[PDB]
């Protein structure tokens, strides 16, 4: 098929992928908010005797303790995973790196400038 069609398909697929990524990310955010709000319920205990108030205070203290323990353990695990990921990434880069240095070219002067230089006096528009 013609190369122009292929480039158009390339950019179209890129745009589609970006749209899907953003949609799924927003979906994840909304669902996460909903589920987390489901997890922890707002309380309403105003005006109650201070005995029950402090009982709730201690209960929430303990709940936060448990939640923080779990979350910190998960965070430590995730950080270890990311550390392994980075180490493997560097190792793979080392194994098959070498001459993969990207290059840039600037000697390719502007085409109009080149045509003007090759033509001279008789070049006004073309």
């Amino acid at each position: 098929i013609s190369a122009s069609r292929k480039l158009q398909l390339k950019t179209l697929m890129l745009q589609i992928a970006k749209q899907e990524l953003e949609r799924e990310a927003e979906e994840r955010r909304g669902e996460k908010g909903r589920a987390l709000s489901t997890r922890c319920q707002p309380l309403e205990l105003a005006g109650l005797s201070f005995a029950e108030l402090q009982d709730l205070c201690r209960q929430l203290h303990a709940r936060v303790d448990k939640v923080d323990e779990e979350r910190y353990d998960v965070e430590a695990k995730v950080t270890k995973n990311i550390t392994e990921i980075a180490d493997l990434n560097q190792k793979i880069f080392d194994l098959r790196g070498k001459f993969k240095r990207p290059t840039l070219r600037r000697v390719r002067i502007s085409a109009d400038a080149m045509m003007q230089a090759l033509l001279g006096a008789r070049a006004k528009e073309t």
Partner: protein, 160 residues
């Protein structure tokens, strides 16, 4: 190389006639009535650029497919638009990495042609199964029937 073909492909016959007149302007009186890699090097030297002949070989080989060392009409247009590399910086590799991560909905480390079909249906361009087969042959270097992530980078290498 095919990128310049795609870029010029948007243009119309006006550019063809413009380059016809340009050939009249530049290549009048030539015994061959064409341009070659040695001819281009000599003209560049006269024009004031001093590249290495290895670069001359690199450019002509990327464009001389039939072995004629010349520029076919279509290939002449592709080369004339090739001298200026307008599409620089090829977007962001990390962005494309994240996009390709989004691509494997099956999350198998391989790209399914069903996702290809869905994406193309989203595009809606005039395409037959042959177009996708040709595209896969262009891309699937290891003939794995998928889009390898390294192959994904290659087929998107420099692609803005």
């Amino acid at each position: 190389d095919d990128i310049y073909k795609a870029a010029v492909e948007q243009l119309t016959e006006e550019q063809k006639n413009e380059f016809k007149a340009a050939f009249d302007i530049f290549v009048l009186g030539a015994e061959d009535g064409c341009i070659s890699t040695k001819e281009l090097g000599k003209v560049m030297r006269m024009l004031g650029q001093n590249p290495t002949p290895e670069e001359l070989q690199e450019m002509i080989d990327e464009v001389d497919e039939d072995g004629s060392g010349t520029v076919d009409f279509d290939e002449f247009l592709v080369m004339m638009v090739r001298c200026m590399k307008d599409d620089s910086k090829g977007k962001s590799e990390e962005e494309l990495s994240d996009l390709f991560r989004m691509f494997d909905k099956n999350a198998d480390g391989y790209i399914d042609l069903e996702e290809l079909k869905i994406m193309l249906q989203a595009t809606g361009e005039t395409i037959t199964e042959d177009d996708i087969e040709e595209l896969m042959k262009d891309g699937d270097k290891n003939n794995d029937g998928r889009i390898d992530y390294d192959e994904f980078l290659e087929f998107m290498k420099g692609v803005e």
